[model samples]
Target: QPVNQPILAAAQSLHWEATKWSSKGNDIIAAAKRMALLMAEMSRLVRGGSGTKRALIQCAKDIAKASDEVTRLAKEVAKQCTDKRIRTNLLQVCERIPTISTQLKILSTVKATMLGRTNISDEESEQATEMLVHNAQNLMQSVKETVREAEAASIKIRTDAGFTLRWVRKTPWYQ
Candidate 1:
């Protein structure tokens, strides 16, 4: 005798939103901001000197674009969240991200103009490169500190409030 067997599979995209920014959401937002800062730092390093000035500029632009995305995401998270503390924190974090992004852009522009490719100067490019590298290192350290604080806040929120949304999924190993 042969018995027929049926298998069921389901998949769907999940979207989460908050009525206000939550401490939990702020953690994610901080992560996004840190990522943007890291990208900017990496760009400053990978894209240096006159020959690479344009690429450096483009990298800076990319970092700004990423920062905008992070801000937008934070706003969206804020809308879905319910906790007042989290929402307020996320908004504050988003605001800082854009401010830093603008500063990075200004720095990039200054370097691009000063590094005139055709008219390569003495040690101008080298000095610019050194400053950029130093600034990036400092920014990265600050970003880590902020991210840690955000994470701690989020953990506290989750522990105090508990999870509002929950789901169960059966993977391939499940039968």
Candidate 2:
């Protein structure tokens, strides 16, 4: 299934607002945000740039597969763990996987539409591409703080549990 960015943002915002954005939600939020950014960029590039979109389609598929893996791991941990807090954290992790996967699918759809033969002129395409890139860059800049918070939360979890969960990291996977 495909995801929508606006819907994901809305859901995240509402959930965090209601839950007070706990350390428990950190991993899920971070993963969703990262995946959204990746999906958005991939779609934009494949749509706007002069390149074959085949590899990008495969990348989108891989992202979905990875999301599934992450969610499965989270579910297993949550189901097996007896601690209330740990279980809650694990559940939170599972919650975000679908949103990311859906958004990636949406991106793929957009890529197909934009790259397809259409009446849009080169100038208009260029203009739209510029805006998309600009917005993506801005989003990345704004998300820096959130990413840091996720890292800190993960670190705290590891410290408290006396083991690594590897929930968050400083760099993107492709980097």
Encode model 2's per-residue lDDT on 1-175: one tens digit a residue. 1333433343343233223333343454444444454544454345434454655556566556645654654554455455566566556646655564556555554554566757768786555444434433333332333333333444333323433344422322321
Off by over 4 Å in 1: 1-50, 117-175
Look at candidate 2 and tell me the lDDT of residue 34. 42
In candidate 1, where is summed lDDT lowest over 10 consecutive residues?
A: 6-15
- Residue 121, model 1: lDDT of 67
State the lDDT at 39 in candidate 2: 44
| TM-score between candidate 1 and the true structure | 0.51
- Angstrom error at residue 57, model 2: 2.2
lDDT (Cα atoms) of all candidates against the true structure: 0.47, 0.46
Query: What are the models' TM-scores?
Result: 0.51, 0.46
